[PDB]
From a paper:
5 is the terminal oxidase of cellular respiration that reduces O2 to water, coupled with a proton-pumping process. The enzyme includes two redox-active metal sites as the low-potential sites (heme a (Fea) and CuA). These sites donate electrons to the O2 reduction site that comprises two high potential metal sites (heme a3 (Fea3) and CuB). The third proton-conducting pathway, the H-pathway, extends for proton pumping from the N-side surface to the P-side surface.
Complete saturation of the azide-binding metal sites is not attained by exposure of CcO to 20 mm azide for 2 days, whereas elongation of the exposure time up to 4 days does not significantly change the X-ray crystal structures. Thus, in contrast to the binding kinetics for the second (low affinity) azide-binding site in solution (faster than the time scale of minutes), 3 days of exposure at 4 °C is necessary for saturation of the two terminal azide-binding sites. The discrepancy is likely to be due to restriction of flexibility in the O2 transfer pathway induced by the crystal packing.
Residue numbers in the entry:
A (entry chain J): 1 to 58
B (entry chain F): 1 to 98
C (entry chain L): 2 to 47
D (entry chain A): 1 to 514
E (entry chain B): 1 to 227
F (entry chain D): 4 to 147
G (entry chain H): 7 to 85
H (entry chain E): 5 to 109
Write the structure that this text describes.
């Protein structure tokens, strides 16, 4: 394998204002959206489950 | 029992890490890693306080092993004195690419 | 950057004192009310 | 911008502010639970229902006040705002992990709320002893939700402790030794060490309870060779350090407040104060079985835990006397924060002395699990931790906000709270000596008079709490902007102005070694 | 039992409870003294316009501040531990009684000689007879011989409880799988009350203890009649 | 004169009896006559009038010691307001008693208490000090 | 040898508040003795002291559960 | 440590320095009033003459106020100190706070 | 102790490689033979329904509620005995 | 522009997604234990893995690629890792306490003996000894890896690290096989409870430590480490020695002394 | 006229503290005598007096005749 | 110039004290609260059996 | 501390409003629940 760290240093030091978690490019945005959507949707689902479990069931 | 292949810091350190490494080789301390050594602190020989702006906070440990630190803004201009012990400080502003 | 200064380093607005009063009422009022409504919930169950 | 700043924060001040808002909201929940307790007891008979709903309320009262009000306010709130500023640091060591310590608390609180919503709640006591907390006497999800709430709060504080220790050891100016840092910084460092060592043991014990409840282990079930008393040891190995974790940052703020409003540049006896907090932290790990003097323990073990528990009075007394000696010769400024601190000193001393009564395991046979214990610890928590919190809040509110409080309103607030908490808790000594048990929804008729007065006291404290909200509203409503603050030369956290900029100490302080 | 407006401990029914009262007197005097001294010094420190704000040397006064509290602690601990070890000495009981905690009542077993056991439940408020005490009376009292050393053994058949009688200075936790021992000796006949002292669920407040202390011959005939 | 928030890093004026000579003068800008007064101050102070001395003082300082140390009537407001809110608390307690609490148990009825009191005396509750000690069993009355 | 039995005497092997092992040990000793005596055709009357001690000290429900388990073959102590 | 006399002499010498500057005048008085004492007349005398060399009448008045303040409830101290200073007050033309009305609340 | 080996002089990769292949992995290979030798199934003991074993205070959250997570029919009896 | 050496971190979503993943995993365990459902738990496990991935990804970006790990930052991370290991030691201490409490005073229900009646312990000289040699050996090979890295030797670093990971995997497979073969279970009283909960958390930490070694292996393949700057490798080696020492205490206490 | 005498000018705070710490201590000895006498001694005497000629059988017979016992009529 | 306390302090102190005493006396004595004081010197014991 | 005069002064009347609203926000919801306890229980 070859040492390509210099390429990645150039990429992540580019003066584009992006925060580190998005600075790798469009794949970062996708993976961020998948993560936050599962967390927020999962949290809404956990609230629904609390509402279900807060009452006795026949 | 022979190979290389592991980069060195000289080859591969980057950003602030590299700045600190290169300045240290020159005996310089632009990122304030070391404690400055005091002068006699008279008005003729004040402690010289570098800054990248027009004022910097000084903490004065007036005597060795005092637990109380005396804090004050030091401004560009005439030397100022610690309000507890009187020792003199004078700001020396600059740009940072020093 | 971000806003700096009094009334700007907080996640709620203090630009209008009556809107603030409403928000503070909802905020502290909801925390104080919650145990009474949980008690009500537990009593209504069984 | 809003989401980036307040959900994605890596800033020690904004995260501190989040913790203060969270702790204040929890304080309202814990106050409401405490008023339901005192409404149940305020006349003889049954108000709400039997001991299940009653001790769900008692249990939640304690968890909320300890884990969601005191610890977030003292350590997450004042620690995050003040520690980096007091050492000239640009932020915490792990600024992004710091934000996870904060955001684990709303889910932890949600789990505790869920516990009380499902089935019949966790009516266990904040100690969560088995078998009452086991899957036979507390079948269903409530106790497991409580366990998980504690796990999340535990992870939050363990990571927070790592953050504070590292920040305080590693991020001071290079000339500042540990013996040149302010006492509040010391108090947070020591509290963080206690958290680091004690919470993993709690986590082990409540995980054992979780597997006894759901995986057919029998750590605490004699049928499998287990032992309910093992749970008590693991819990109190954490729980005694925990009460010193609750009070140590309070001691640190009291030292700063007393020094400041005495017009002093420094507390009396700085190295003795450091020695005393370190000694209290250390001794706080070898005393836990004073919570178990009636479980059937051998006599020599009782003699040791009696003696070790008492010895903590020596470093603690050094701190009380050193606060008195800080006042001595002061230009005393009778600000509302000074009043909170003076009330702290006196009320903490009362509760410490009733602790000394209880340390005698022979007298503790009669006092254990009675309201004498409840009186002991509400003098150190509701008139120690709460008074140190209120003192620090009114002292540093202008720093955090840039605005001033109305000092006359704040003094009125102090006066009402002082009357209310003493009327609430002082009669509980009588109830305990005369034998009223803890965790009771109702009492034999003889106990009526003191329970009536105690419940009336709790309503006076309610009025103080409502007034506190109004006082904070009035400050933000009127917008009196701070101009000058005295004694900045010995209170570095004020020297960047009120409120300090988002980024402070981008250029670090200059301190030479001489 | 407790009485309205009571401030302190119930009157002692046993010699050990007597000892605890005098030790409490010895200790509360110290509590009052120290708390009042701190309050007064707070007032001495706070009531003068004279000032002295320069650095003050600490080591001489910290000697006083550690040595004097250490002495006070020793003055408390010495009689404290004397009572602890006296409470622990061997006494030779004449009788063993077991009590088992349950949700929510106590059972009692007196099996030195015969198979005697019964349950003991709170009298409900609506069934009290005039003059009886709300939440304290039971249907079947723990009759016991006065002026004799009795071994009580305490356990539980479900969750934790705790078996207490404040006027005898007694509180022993009731733990399933464990048999805890305490000794009891009443100087006087009469009725001595206590209440479950470890949270145990829905009716924790409502499973009291009533001892009925009588001469040995009455205890023997009561025992025979309870078979 | 006029203190600004953006001056926080500069030496500032304070009136404190333990810091009698603050870091700056109270008033730094001088009118024509105030400039002339500062020049006059370089000559004998015996030639300054009383009003000129007072004006020099009030240029250097804001409040005198007597002004900055004065007592106030604030305690009346604090004590009075605290008693008002304690009074308001009793309104809440009155409300609670009327609308929340039901009847207390029948064991507090006067006849029950009289009979219970006799039964407590018959079993010699707290006979050494606390309760029955206060009853005279010979005269059938509460001891004087 | 010594009747006028009143209750179990102090036993220096079990001097502390937890008496669980005292009950257990006397229960075992009684049934161990009774197995010995009824094996060699001797008299269980020599086991009586242990029987009296464990009856005094042991909760009825412990004895009953242990007796059931002996009969079931699930008693985990050695007899 | 040092005698009372040595303490007083050090402070007289401090204020008597001919070219003492404004910063040193303020530092001296603000340090001195931290001690558990009211300064002797001879110390105050030297401080007032320092004010005179620094052309600072107001600070001379303020020094008199702080003498009075340091005495606390001991009402006899200030009139004695003013008595002892009257030759200096007359020589330098220093009016007291009372003579200026600055003792009024 | 001191082990009984005995090198030093300065610090190195070559020494720790020597210890990896010369001491550590041989010991693993030896213990692997020792184990792969005392292996092969052991005769299971009579079933006795001891009450301190096979605890069930709540069904397991998987399967039929009565089987442990790594249940081995050959050596793990159920509360009612070995499976048939 | 700062003139200190410390790292101001970019505002980040991963603290919030991690906190929410803790809510989903705990409420998910509740749903699994009480409401016969794994849905919430699998979502929580998934978001937890995504959070860890992106968070530690970003730490590599900030250090190897952006240069923010000055010596002062590295020194903070060293303290952080040591303190984290200390907290994990105290966590295992609770389980060792439970083990000694139950085994030193075996109750009548057990037969009043340790091991309990009806328990047939594993032979500590068979697979448990083999596991001990495997983890000790992996402590030797990871030290070889460390010295090769400091000496600038890429190939022998990778060979030694691969050996270390292979040994960690061998331990895990051996332990999994021993779990399946064990004639006692987690429901077998306090013996099975202490055995499986203590060795099971230890096994989880072996899997965590092995994963961390594998992360270091792939970073090494990508040349991220210099011969002087490689704190992720050092932290993983410290954690690996901690896992080894916990095993040695378990072996002596539970497998040997407790047999 | 006459000159004012020189008053004490030094150590006024220390002198005040010294005087009052001794008075603080004297209170405590004076209080301790009161608490020992009004409370602790009173209690010892109350128990000694009560039991000095106490007749437990007589106490029992009074209680029995009052009807308070389950086991004894 | 007189501030809020000079102008209103006397009134606030007087009215606050009067109100506080009046409403606590009323609450304490007029609304049926059972304080359950000691029977000593108050209650005539009455036959119960 | 010194401070500027209020940028947005809150008059006595405004304070009475803020104080009243604040107190009612705590008292009314709790009061409603406690008033209706019998309805919840005796249900
Ligand atoms: C902030 C919280 C806090 C603090 C600081 C303390 C401090 C102390 N506590 Fe407290 N305690 C609790 C919170 C706290 N406690 C809680 C919550 C419980 C019950 C938990 C539960 O069951 O839920 C409890 C329970 C508790 C018990 C158990 C009672 C029982 O359950 O039967 C005991 C007995 O040992 C005890 C003793 C003490 C002692 C000796 C101190 C000492 O550290 C105090 C030392 C301080 C002083 C003594 C005052 C100042 C000293 C001087 C002025 C010098 C002169 C003094 C002397 C010479 C004595 N505590
Ligand atoms: C910090 C801990 C804490 C605090 C503050 C309190 C406060 C109060 N507690 Fe608490 N209490 C406990 C911890 C605490 N308690 C514990 C641990 C138990 C034992 C639980 C168990 O037995 O298992 C307990 C038990 C307990 C009982 C015994 C229950 C029983 O045995 O049946 C009672 C009864 O009166 C009681 C009453 C009160 C009351 C009236 C207050 C009031 O004083 C509350 C008044 C309101 C405040 C003190 C202000 C609240 C704080 C704020 C609003 C924050 C403001 C925020 C900012 C400025 C940023 N408590
Ligand atoms: C190979 C080693 C790794 C094990 C992998 C298996 C999955 C478990 C994951 C690891 C968690 C480790 C500890 C959890 C406790 C129990 C697991 C013990 C290890 C184990 O796997 O035990 C198995 C039982 O697993 C069971 O019950 C299964 C229970 C599975 C769900 C566990 C849920 C409980 C999780 C609680 C975690 C709380 C953590 C809090 C952290 C503290 C915060 C500060 C033993 O199988 P057995 O059939 O009984 O006997 C074998 C007979 N042939
Ligand atoms: C499976 C069920 C759920 C369990 C989830 C856990 C699963 C597995 C997690 C395995 C852990 C992987 C950790 C990877 C960290 C990679 C980032 C890293 O290693 O970052 C290093 C910093 O170290 C650092 O932050 C150090 C970072 C500290 C990491 C600590 C890791 C241990 C975490 C364990 C979680 C504990 C769970 C306990 C349960 C009881 C980067 O600095 P360097 O290496 O110097 O490089 C810089 C040079 O290139 C410049 O020349
Ligand atoms: C522990 C903290 C709380 C303690 C103190 C609470 C003080 C109470 C404040 C007022 O609360 C309100 O009181 C009303 C009565 O005064 C209730 O109205 C009820 O009663 C009225 C009169 O019967 C009817 O008009 C209403 O419809 C009926 O809701 C009303 O719901 C409730 O909000
Ligand atoms: Cu039984 Cu509480
Ligand atoms: Cu404790
Ligand atoms: Mg208890
Ligand atoms: Na009640
Ligand atoms: Na290394
Ligand atoms: Zn200095």
């Amino acid at each position: 394998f070859e040492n390509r760290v210099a390429e990645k240093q150039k990429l992540f030091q580019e003066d584009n204002g992006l925060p580190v978690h998005l600075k790798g490019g469009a794949t970062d945005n996708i993976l961020y959206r998948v993560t936050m959507t599962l967390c927020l949707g999962g949290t809404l689902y956990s609230l629904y489950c609390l509402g279900w479990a807060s009452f006795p069931h026949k | 029992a022979s190979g290389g292949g592991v980069p060195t810091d000289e080859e591969q350190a980057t950003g602030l890490e590299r700045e600190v490494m290169l300045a240290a080789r020159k005996g310089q301390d632009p990122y304030n890693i070391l404690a400055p050594k005091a002068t006699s602190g008279t008005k003729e020989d004040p402690n010289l306080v570098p800054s990248i702006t027009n004022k910097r906070i000084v903490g004065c440990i007036c005597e060795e092993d005092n637990s109380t630190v005396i804090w004050f803004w030091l401004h560009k201009g005439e030397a100022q004195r610690c309000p507890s012990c009187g020792t003199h400080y004078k700001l020396v502003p600059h740009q940072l690419a020093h | 950057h971000y806003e700096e200064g009094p009334g700007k380093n907080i996640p709620f607005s203090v630009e209008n004192k009556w809107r603030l009063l409403a928000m503070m009422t909802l905020f502290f009022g909801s925390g104080f009310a919650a145990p009474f409504f949980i008690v009500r919930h537990q009593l209504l169950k069984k | 911008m809003f989401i980036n700043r307040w959900l994605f924060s890596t800033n020690h001040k904004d995260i501190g502010t989040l913790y203060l808002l969270f702790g204040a909201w929890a304080g309202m929940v814990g106050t409401a639970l405490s008023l339901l307790i005192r409404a149940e007891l305020g006349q003889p008979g049954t108000l709400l229902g039997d001991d299940q709903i009653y001790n769900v309320v008692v249990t939640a009262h304690a968890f909320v006040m300890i884990f969601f009000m005191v610890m977030p306010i003292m350590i997450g709130g004042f620690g995050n705002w003040l520690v980096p500023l007091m050492i000239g640091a640009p932020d915490m060591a792990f600024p992004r992990m710091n934000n996870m310590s904060f955001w684990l608390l709303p889910p932890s609180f949600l789990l505790l709320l869920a516990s009380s919503m499902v089935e019949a709640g966790a009516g266990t006591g904040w100690t969560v002893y088995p078998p009452l907390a086991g899957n036979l006497a507390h079948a269903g999800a409530s106790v497991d939700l409580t366990i998980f709430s504690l796990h999340l709060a535990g992870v939050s504080s363990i990571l927070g402790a790592i953050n504070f220790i590292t920040t305080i050891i590693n991020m001071k100016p290079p000339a500042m030794s540990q013996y040149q840092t302010p006492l509040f910084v010391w108090s947070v460092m020591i509290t963080a060490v206690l958290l680091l060592l004690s919470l993993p043991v709690l986590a082990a014990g409540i995980t054992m309870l979780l597997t006894d409840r759901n995986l057919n282990t029998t750590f605490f079930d004699p049928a499998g060779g287990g032992d309910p008393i093992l749970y008590q040891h693991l819990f109190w190995f954490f729980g005694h350090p925990e009460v010193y974790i609750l009070i140590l940052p309070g001691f640190g703020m009291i030292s700063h407040i007393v020094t400041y409003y005495s017009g002093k540049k420094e507390p009396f006896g700085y190295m003795g104060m450091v020695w005393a907090m370190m000694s209290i932290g250390f001794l706080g790990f070898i005393v836990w079985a004073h919570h178990m003097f009636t479980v059937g323990m051998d006599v020599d073990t009782r003699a040791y835990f009696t003696s070790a528990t008492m010895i903590i009075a020596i470093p603690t007394g050094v701190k009380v006397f050193s606060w008195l000696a800080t006042l001595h010769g002061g230009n005393i400024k009778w600000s509302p924060a000074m009043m909170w601190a003076l009330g702290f000193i006196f009320l903490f001393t009362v509760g410490g002395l009733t602790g000394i009564v209880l340390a005698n395991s022979s007298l503790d046979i009669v006092l254990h699990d009675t309201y004498y214990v409840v009186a002991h610890f509400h003098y150190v928590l509701s008139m120690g931790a709460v008074f140190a919190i209120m003192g620090g809040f009114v002292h540093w509110f202008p720093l955090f906000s840039g605005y001033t409080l109305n000092d006359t309103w704040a003094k009125i607030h102090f006066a009402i709270m002082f009357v209310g908490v003493n009327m609430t808790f002082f009669p509980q000594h009588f109830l305990g000596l005369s034998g009223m048990p803890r965790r009771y929804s109702d009492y034999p008729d003889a106990y009526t008079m003191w329970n009536t007065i105690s419940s009336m006291g709790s309503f006076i404290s309610l009025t103080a709490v409502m007034l506190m909200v109004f006082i904070i509203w009035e400050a933000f409503a009127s917008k009196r902007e701070v101009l000058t603050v005295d004694l900045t030369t010995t209170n570095l956290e004020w020297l960047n102005g009120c409120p300090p900029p988002y980024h402070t100490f981008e250029e670090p302080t200059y301190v030479n070694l001489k | 039992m407790a009485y309205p407006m009571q401030l302190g401990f119930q009157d002692a029914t046993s010699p050990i409870m007597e000892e605890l009262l005098h030790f409490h007197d010895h200790t509360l005097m110290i509590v009052f003294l120290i708390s009042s001294l701190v309050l007064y010094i707070i007032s001495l420190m706070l009531t003068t316009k004279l000032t002295h704000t320069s650095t003050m040397d600490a080591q001489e006064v910290e000697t006083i501040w550690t040595i004097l509290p250490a002495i006070i602690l020793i003055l408390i601990a010495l009689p404290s531990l004397r009572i602890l070890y006296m409470m622990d000495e061997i006494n030779n009981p004449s009788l063993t009684v077991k009590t088992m905690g349950h949700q929510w009542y106590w059972s009692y077993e007196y099996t030195d000689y015969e198979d005697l056991s019964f349950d003991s439940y709170m009298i409900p408020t609506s069934e009290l007879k005039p003059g009886e005490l709300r939440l304290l009376e039971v249907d079947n009292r723990v009759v016991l011989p006065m002026e004799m050393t009795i071994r009580m053994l305490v356990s539980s058949e479900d969750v934790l409880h705790s078996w207490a009688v404040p006027s005898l200075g007694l509180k022993t936790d009731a733990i399933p799988g464990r048999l805890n021992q305490t000794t009891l000796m009443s100087s006087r006949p009469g009725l001595y009350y206590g209440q479950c002292s470890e949270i145990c669920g829905s009716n924790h407040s409502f499973m009291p203890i009533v001892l009925e202390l009588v001469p040995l011959k009455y205890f023997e005939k009561w025992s025979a009649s309870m078979l | 004169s006029v203190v600004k928030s953006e001056d926080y890093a500069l030496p500032s004026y304070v009136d404190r009896r333990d810091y009698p000579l603050p870091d700056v003068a109270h008033v730094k800008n001088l009118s024509a006559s105030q400039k002339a007064l500062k020049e006059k101050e370089k000559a004998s102070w015996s030639s300054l009038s009383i009003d000129e001395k007072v004006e020099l003082y009030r240029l250097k300082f804001k409040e005198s010691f007597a002004e900055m140390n004065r007592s106030t009537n604030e305690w009346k407001t604090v004590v009075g307001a605290a008693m008002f809110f304690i009074g308001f608390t009793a309104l809440l307690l009155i409300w609670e008693k009327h609308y929340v609490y039901g009847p207390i148990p029948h064991t507090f009825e006067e006849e029950w208490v009289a009979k219970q009191t006799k039964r407590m005396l018959d079993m010699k509750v707290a006979p050494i000090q606390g309760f029955s000690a206060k009853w005279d069993y010979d005269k059938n009355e509460w001891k004087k | 040898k010594i009747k006028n039995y009143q209750t179990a005497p102090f036993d220096s092997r079990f001097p502390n508040q937890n008496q669980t092992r005292n009950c257990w040990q006397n229960y075992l000793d009684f049934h161990r003795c009774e197995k010995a005596m009824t094996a060699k055709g001797g008299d269980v009357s020599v086991c009586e002291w242990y029987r009296r001690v464990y009856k005094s000290l042991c909760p009825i429900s412990w004895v009953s559960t242990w007796d059931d388990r002996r009969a079931e073959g699930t008693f985990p102590g050695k007899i | 440590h040092e005698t009372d006399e040595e303490f007083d002499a050090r402070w007289v010498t401090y204020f008597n320095k001919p070219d003492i500057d404004a910063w040193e005048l303020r530092k001296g008085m603000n340090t001195l009033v931290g001690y558990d004492l009211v300064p002797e007349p001879k110390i105050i005398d030297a401080a007032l003459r320092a004010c005179r060399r620094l052309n600072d009448f107001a600070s001379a008045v303020r020094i008199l106020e702080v003498v009075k303040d340091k005495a606390g409830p001991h009402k006899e101290i200030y009139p004695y100190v003013i008595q002892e200073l009257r030759p200096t007050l007359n020589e330098l033309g220093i009016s007291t706070p009372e003579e200026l009305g600055l003792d009024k609340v | 102790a001191s082990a009984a080996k005995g090198d030093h002089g300065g610090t190195g990769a070559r020494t720790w490689r020597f210890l990896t292949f010369g001491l550590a992995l041989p010991s693993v290979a030896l213990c692997t033979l020792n184990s792969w030798l005392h292996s092969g199934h052991r005769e299971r003991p009579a079933f006795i329904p001891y009450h301190h074993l096979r605890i069930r205070t709540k069904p397991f959250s998987w399967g039929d509620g009565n089987h442990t997570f790594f249940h081995n029919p050959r050596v793990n009896p159920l509360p009612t005995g070995y499976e048939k | 522009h700062q003139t200190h050496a410390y790292h101001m971190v970019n505002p980040s979503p991963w603290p919030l997604t991690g906190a929410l993943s803790a809510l989903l995993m705990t409420s998910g365990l509740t749903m699994w234990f009480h409401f016969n459902s794994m849905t919430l738990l699998m979502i929580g496990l998934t978001t937890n893995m995504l959070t860890m991935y992106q968070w530690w990804r970003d730490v590599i970006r900030e250090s190897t690629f952006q240069g923010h790990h000055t010596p002062a930052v590295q020194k903070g991370l060293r303290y952080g890792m040591i303190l984290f290991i200390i907290s994990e030691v105290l966590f295992f201490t609770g389980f060792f306490w439970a083990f000694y409490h139950s085994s030193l005073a075996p109750t009548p229900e057990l037969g009043g003996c340790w091991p309990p009646t009806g328990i047939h312990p594993l032979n500590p000289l068979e697979v448990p000894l083999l596991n001990t040699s495997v983890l000790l050996a992996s402590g030797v090979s990871i030290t070889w890896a460390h010295h090769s890295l400091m000496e600038g030797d890429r190939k022998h670093m990778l060979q030694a690290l691969f050996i270390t990971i292979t040994l960690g995997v061998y331990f895990t497979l051996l332990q999994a096989s021993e779990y399946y073969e064990a004639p006692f279970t987690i429901s077998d009283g306090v013996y099975g409870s202490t055995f499986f909960v203590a060795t099971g958390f230890h096994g989880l930490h072996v899997i965590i430590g092995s994963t961390f070694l594998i992360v270091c292996f792939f970073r090494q393949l990508k040349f991220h480490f210099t011969s002087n700057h490689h704190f992720g490798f050092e932290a993983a080696a410290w954690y690996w020695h901690f896992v080894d020492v916990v095993w040695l205490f378990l072996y002596v206490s539970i497998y040997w002394w407790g047999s | 006229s006459t000159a004012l005498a020189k008053p004490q000018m030094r150590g006024l705070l220390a002198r005040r503290l010294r005087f009052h710490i001794v008075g603080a201590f004297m209170v405590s000895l004076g209080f301790a005598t009161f608490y020992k006498f009004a409370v602790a001694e009173k209690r010892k005497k109350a128990y000694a007096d009560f039991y000095r000629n106490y007749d437990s059988m007589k106490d029992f017979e009074e209680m029995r005749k009052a009807g308070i016992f389950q086991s004894a009529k | 110039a007189p501030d809020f306390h000079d102008k209103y302090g006397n009134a606030v102190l007087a009215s606050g004290a009067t109100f506080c005493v009046a409403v606590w006396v009323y609450m304490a004595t007029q609304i049926g609260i059972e304080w359950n004081p000691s029977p000593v010197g108050r209650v005539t014991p009455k036959e119960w059996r | 501390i010194t401070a500027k005069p209020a940028k947005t002064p809150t008059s006595p009347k405004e304070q009475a409003i803020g104080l009243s609203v604040t107190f009612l926000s705590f008292l009314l919801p709790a009061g409603w629940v406690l008033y209706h306890l019998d309805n919840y229980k005796k249900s």
